[PDB]
Design a binder for this molecule. Structure first.
Ligand code: HEM
Length: 148
């Protein structure tokens, strides 16, 4: 598949510095959907502003977790069936913390923003399409965690 190669090559750029890039992803996410901020409750306390989240070690560890799951999807781009049961359970976990299924479209747009800004002119419409399809497949598997 030509799409598989566009994903592996663009990911190579991002995965060199995962926290710096995941920081961009989450900064964009809170700019688009501020109501996601209170869902990160560590020690039963809420962040007041988005910049508060960037000083939290637990929050930064969640950024690392996110980037590792994407890395697993990229590594298995030819065979995403192998990640399916793990992703369903990851969906169930997020449902339990209070994430709505609709918020996964915002996450997808923030991922595309982070790729666009990192790759610049190397972010071609073919690259955008490849990532949209991969992200779509990941979301389909996770959405099984919301009962169906
Ligand atoms: C709407 C955006 C999201 C919110 C509000 C959110 C919130 C959380 C919270 C509160 C936890 C538990 C505390 C913690 O482990 O830090 C968590 C766990 C986790 N999240 Fe997220 N998350 C979001 C998106 C994602 C995405 C897109 C991925 C990966 C693709 C991801 C991967 C994980 C992983 C791997 C865990 C640990 C699950 C476990 O094994 O218990 N999360 N999420």
């Amino acid at each position: 598949r030509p799409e598989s190669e566009l994903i592996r090559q663009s990911w190579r750029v991002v995965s060199r510095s995962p926290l710096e890039h995941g920081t961009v992803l989450f900064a964009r996410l809170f700019a688009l959907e501020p109501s996601l901020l209170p869902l990160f409750q560590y020690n039963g306390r809420q962040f007041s502003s988005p910049e508060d989240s960037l000083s939290s070690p637990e929050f930064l560890d969640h950024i690392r977790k996110v980037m590792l799951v994407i890395d697993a999807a990229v590594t298995n781009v030819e065979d995403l069936s192998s990640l399916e049961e793990y992703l369903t359970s990851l969906g169930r976990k997020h449902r339990a913390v209070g994430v709505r299924l609709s918020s996964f479209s915002t996450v997808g747009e923030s991922l595309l923003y982070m790729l666009e800004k990192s790759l610049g002119p190397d972010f071609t419409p073919a690259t955008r399409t490849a990532w949209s399809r991969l992200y779509g497949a990941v979301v389909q598997a996770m959405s099984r965690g919301w009962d169906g």
